[PDB]
Design a protein around this ligand. Structure first.
Ligand SMILES: Nc1ncnc2c1ncn2[C@@H]1O[C@H](COP(=O)(O)O)[C@@H](O)[C@H]1O
Ligand SMILES: CC(=O)c1nc(C(=O)O)cc2c1[nH]c1ccccc12
Length: 486
């Protein structure tokens, strides 16, 4: 039964559940809030099969809200703070939302949204103009008819539907990666997506969530020492900022058992630097919206240069194959599409079987990534499938070219893209972020690529840029970079 997940999380909640700016929230008090919010949502006439769209910051009540939405047999639809109003609004409609719950601090955006899309019930976490204040008896669970816990939105936004079973499996995966708890887990990523699942993993294992509204290196350092945090999750760029910060050696981070980073391709040289400066606590995570968790790179893995280009070994119960355009399994060392079968994979795109069937086949999920396994069974990603540069029936993997460029001491980041060319097939182009106050020779960089990879991989055009543009999700916006060179 689908209510098993929400109950698992509830069941786990320990003495102290959340800490933040304002101070601590006991297990008791959080449990109470779930019951409260659950009852209020039930009473407001929200039926089991439907979604509850939620717009909030990184607050402890938002932790309760997700759990309440799931407990009452609904599917949580976390509205991403970085997303545009038109994307958020499309998401509310497509997810079959029976409600919009929002926090006062984002009433402006809530109003904006409600001009664009209609919704039966509009509720708010505290007094507000545009909605009814929920905050004014045991937890009464209902079952989602189709067992969905979460719908999270991605060309054009698809809604990834994750089962209650899949989210339960994620707890087991989290334990297998992060240690037995309790964890004091610092979460500065938004509670609307992975952040919110990590909070649930943390609660379920008897730990304490430590919330920050945003990432600042000073604040994270301070928080780790002050709350004696054991775990934290960072975007790769945040890792680099934290590791390179001047106050790091001054700070006491002896409490850390895991500094977790992922969600975007890592710069090997910057990771190596972080591994040196931060010690044996570095762990990388690889997943996708469709796949959830796939692989992790341990702190001991980070002590082999050869593995700094890897995502790591697949997690327990995660089957991975490398496959050709046809669909046949390739040998170790060969490069092809990464396919995944696991208890954590999506059920499908919400109310879209046509698109789902292009991505699932035989219980296997097409990640959209391309890569290969090494002799010791670590997965190495060479590219997003859309980012491969084809020259006359040869594959140039843009990440391999970036790795070489970024190894140069005067280069911090690189985005390599192809643009079409009749005489070269496609022309390799590189946007490069330079170090500090450095001024490397484009030709040295071309020469470096030429020595390591060969003639075809060498970028014709090299542009120095202040930063690599990112998507709202925080990934390299390689469609933007592509436009710079057309
Ligand atoms: N730890 C990681 N290392 C490298 N790439 C990653 C990592 N985590 C996520 N990604 C990339 O992000 C993609 C999934 O993002 P999304 O489609 O937004 O869920 C994957 O296909 C990967 O290429
Ligand atoms: C583990 C990880 O880094 C990760 N990345 C993404 C991504 O989109 O890059 C997505 C997920 C990741 N872990 C997950 C667990 C459950 C559901 C979704 C995810």
């Amino acid at each position: 039964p689908a209510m098993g997940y929400a109950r698992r999380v509830m069941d786990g909640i320990g003495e102290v559940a959340v800490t933040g700016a304002g101070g601590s929230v006991t297990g008791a008090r959080l449990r109470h809030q779930v019951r409260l919010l659950a009852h209020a949502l039930t009473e407001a006439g929200i039926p089991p099969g439907r979604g509850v769209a939620c717009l909030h910051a990184n607050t402890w009540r938002a932790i309760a809200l997700r759990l309440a939405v799931q407990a009452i047999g609904c599917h949580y639809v976390g509205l991403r703070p970085t997303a545009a109003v038109t994307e958020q609004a499309r998401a509310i409609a497509a997810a079959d939302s029976a409600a919009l719950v929002f926090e006062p601090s984002v009433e402006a955006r809530a109003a904006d949204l409600l001009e664009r899309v209609s919704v039966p019930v509009v509720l708010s976490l505290g007094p507000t103009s545009r909605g009814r204040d929920i905050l004014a008896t045991p937890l009464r669970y209902r079952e989602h008819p189709e067992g969905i816990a979460v719908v999270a939105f991605t060309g054009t936004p698809k809604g990834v539907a994750h089962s209650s079973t899949a989210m339960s499996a994620c707890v087991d995966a989290a334990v297998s990666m992060y240690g037995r708890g309790p964890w004091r887990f610092l979460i500065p990523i938004p509670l609307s997506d992975l952040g919110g699942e990590l909070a649930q993993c943390t609660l379920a294992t008897g730990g304490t969530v430590v919330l920050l509204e945003e990432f600042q290196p000073d604040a994270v350092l301070e928080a780790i020492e002050r709350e004696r945090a054991t775990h934290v999750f960072l975007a790769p760029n945040w890792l680099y900022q934290l590791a390179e910060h001047p106050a790091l050696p001054r700070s006491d981070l002896s409490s850390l058992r895991r500094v977790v980073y992922g969600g975007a391709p890592a710069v090997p040289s910057r990771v190596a630097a972080a591994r040196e400066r931060m010690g044996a606590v570095l762990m990388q995570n690889y997943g996708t919206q469709e796949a959830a968790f796939i692989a992790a790179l341990t702190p001991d893995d980070h002590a082999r240069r050869e593995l700094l280009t890897a995502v790591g070994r697949p997690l327990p119960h995660v089957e991975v194959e490398i496959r050709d355009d046809s669909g046949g399994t390739l040998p170790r060392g060969a490069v092809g599409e990464v396919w995944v079968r696991s208890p954590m994979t999506m059920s499908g795109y919400w109310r879209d079987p046509e698109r789902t069937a292009q991505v699932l086949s035989g219980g296997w999920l097409r990640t959209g990534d391309v890569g290969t396994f090494d002799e010791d069974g670590h997965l190495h990603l060479t590219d997003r499938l859309q980012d491969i540069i084809i020259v006359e029936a040869y594959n140039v993997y843009s990440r391999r070219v970036e790795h070489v460029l970024t190894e140069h001491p005067d280069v911090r980041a690189a985005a390599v893209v192809g643009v079409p060319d009749p005489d070269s097939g496609e022309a390799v182009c590189a946007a490069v972020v330079v170090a500090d106050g450095a001024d490397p020779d484009p030709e040295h960089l071309r020469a470096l690529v030429r020595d390591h990879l060969g003639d075809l991989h060498v970028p014709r055009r090299v542009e120095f840029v202040r930063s690599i543009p990112v998507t709202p999700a925080g990934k390299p916006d390689k469609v933007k970079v592509r436009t710079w060179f057309t």
